[PDB]
């Protein structure tokens, strides 16, 4: 009576701040063609997150494999058509929306997401479908995702040591060196995230529960081995809230491939997405989204209960799955 953290610790109740899946963000439901699917509906940005296509030498950021191109020869990205669409530089983005005061105010990341969100037909704008955008911090280049899907894997599709050689389009969401400077945005990403969302790993500090006047400790934890700050983050990302479950499938593959060759905008837009038939798959942000790292004795501590305060601990690092792989802040 009362908590002198709370306001600061708001950006760590992810079930509110983000309200979606993290490893797999498929929170909204939207009609694409006759069919209805599930689309990334996350209020927070996922720093360092990206898509790896297994048995490929092609980036997920490369434009889509439309026409004669073999599916796995391409990436997820929206086609190059007008370099003032995708990918677009922050310079051009500032130039593009020059005559809007309300938005010229926005940061690079939020503007990027706002740009991806702009692609609707006035009359249909009521439709809560938009293309997800990904922002590269080192390039300062915003890319549009033609594919809203995140994990084609499991049974029919991706079984270990494939008979389909490399031909099969197998993908999973990962956090690593390649993606270190990347950031996965939804249509829903809040314009005020540098206030509502977790960005950097809290250096020389640790997550705890505020109990009866004293910043107490975590009641339940899962102790796992972590060699680095990155390893911890990576672990708690796999552990975090995820909408599409572990090894999920329902659509055909050659029919999905046909759509790509036959350059169908809706087939591509909808490719490898779960239905809006169903809602129980939505994590809504609930999950094992938070971790603590004992760097002095390499251990990761994950939990499925939101933190409500921090401990002055110098040998520790407090992190969330949305939080940046490298970025850190020892402030307290």
């Amino acid at each position: 009576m009362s908590n002198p953290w709370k306001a600061f610790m708001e950006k760590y109740d992810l079930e509110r701040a983000h309200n979606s899946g993290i490893r797999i963000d498929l929170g909204e439901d939207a009609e694409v063609g006759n069919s209805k699917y599930r689309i990334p509906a996350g209020k927070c940005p996922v720093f360092g997150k990206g898509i790896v296509i297994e048995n490929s030498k092609v980036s997920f950021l490369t434009p889509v494999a439309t026409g004669a191109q073999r599916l796995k020869e391409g990436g997820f990205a929206f086609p190059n058509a007008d370099d003032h669409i995708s990918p677009i530089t922050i310079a051009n983005l500032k130039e593009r929306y020059k005559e809007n005061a309300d938005l010229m105010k926005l940061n690079d990341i939020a503007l990027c997401k706002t740009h991806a969100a702009s692609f609707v037909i006035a009359e249909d704008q009521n439709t809560n479908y938009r293309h997800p955008a990904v922002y590269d911090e080192k390039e300062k280049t915003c890319y549009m995702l033609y594919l809203s899907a995140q994990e084609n894997m499991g049974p029919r599709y991706c079984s270990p040591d494939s008979q389909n050689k490399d031909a099969m389009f197998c993908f999973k969401p990962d956090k690593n060196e390649k993606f270190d400077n990347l950031v996965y945005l939804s249509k829903n990403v809040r314009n005020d995230w540098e206030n509502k969302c977790p960005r950097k790993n809290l250096g020389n500090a640790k997550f705890g529960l505020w109990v009866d006047g004293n910043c107490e400790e975590i009641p339940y934890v899962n102790e796992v081995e972590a060699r680095s700050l990155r390893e911890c983050n990576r672990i708690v990302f796999e552990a975090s809230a995820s909408d599409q479950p572990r090894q999920y499938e329902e659509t055909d593959y050659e029919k999905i491939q046909e759509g790509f060759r036959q350059n169908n905008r809706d087939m591509i837009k909808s490719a490898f997405l779960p239905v809006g038939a169903s809602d129980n798959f939505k994590s809504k942000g609930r999950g094992y989204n938070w971790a603590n790292f004992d760097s002095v004795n390499n251990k990761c501590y994950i939990f499925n209960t939101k933190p409500t305060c921090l401990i002055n601990d110098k040998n520790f690092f407090a992190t969330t799955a949305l939080s940046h792989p490298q970025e850190v802040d020892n402030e307290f």
Partner: antibody, heavy 121, light 108 residues
Framework: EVQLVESGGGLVQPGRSLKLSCAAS????????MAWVRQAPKKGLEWVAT????????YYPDSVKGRFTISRDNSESSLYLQMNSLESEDTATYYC??????????????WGQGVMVTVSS | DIQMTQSPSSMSASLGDRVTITCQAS??????LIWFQQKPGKSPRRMIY???KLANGVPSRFSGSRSGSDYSLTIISLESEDMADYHC?????????FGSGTRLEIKR
């Protein structure tokens, strides 16, 4: 390389009905939204209706709401505008124009030749 | 209910001269504006899309300009194939509304 050939139209008395077809050719129809636009003699254009690639949703302004209906058959590449309980102020030339697709600059790039539709007693 | 106010009613211009039609909307359109050339008895043709982006085939003498509520189209080195009506359109908000039109008559 892209065709929009309207058909139908002509004269009809008020309260009566009329269907305007528009065969599309040269483009992958099912990849584009479609629309109808009308033009009264010595007057500006008037957006009439919109239809999604699938046909899922239809958009009409208060001007010809629930008295007009837009439709399409992507399997046999063609568009329609069923005009019911017609008015003398509905007397204009009708244009099937290829509506856009979000993230593309297709918006009203191509139109049909036009079709004279006359309503009077 | 997005009032498009295309002005003037019509205008006279000599050859090589410049002409500026100024379409202005009541509420906010982004850069969702289209200039259309309509020639006597023929289907209109797209000139300028996304308020400033000159569409395929449309000559360099054509160009669009935004400044708040106001939008304009300019034909700079006037030809005998500029004798047409010019129309604006907002495709930002439902319902899609057009301006009155502007009759381009060429001085001889």
């Amino acid at each position: 390389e892209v065709q929009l050939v309207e058909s139908g139209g002509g004269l009809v008395q008020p309260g009566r009905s009329l269907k305007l077809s528009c065969a599309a050719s040269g483009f992958t129809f099912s990849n584009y939204y479609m629309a109808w636009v009308r033009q009264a003699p010595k007057k500006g254009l008037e957006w009439v209706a919109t239809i999604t690639t699938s046909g899922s949703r239809s958009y009409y302004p208060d001007s010809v709401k629930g008295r007009f209906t837009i439709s399409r058959d992507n399997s046999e590449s063609s568009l329609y505008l069923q005009m019911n309980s017609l008015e003398s102020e509905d007397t204009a030339t009708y244009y099937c124009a290829r509506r856009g697709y979000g993230g593309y600059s297709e918006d009203f790039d191509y139109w049909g030749q036009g079709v004279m539709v006359t309503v009077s007693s | 209910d997005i009032q498009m106010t295309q002005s003037p009613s019509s205008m006279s211009a000599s050859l090589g001269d410049r002409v500026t039609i100024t379409c202005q909307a009541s509420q906010d359109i982004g850069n969702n504006l289209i200039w259309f050339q309509q020639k006597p008895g023929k289907s209109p043709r797209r000139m300028i899309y996304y308020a400033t982006k000159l569409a395929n085939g449309v000559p360099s003498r054509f160009s669009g300009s935004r400044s708040g509520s106001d939008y304009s189209l300019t034909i700079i080195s006037l030809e005998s194939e500029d004798m047409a009506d010019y129309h604006c359109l907002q495709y930002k908000q439902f319902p899609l509304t057009f301006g009155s039109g502007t009759r381009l008559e060429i001085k001889r």
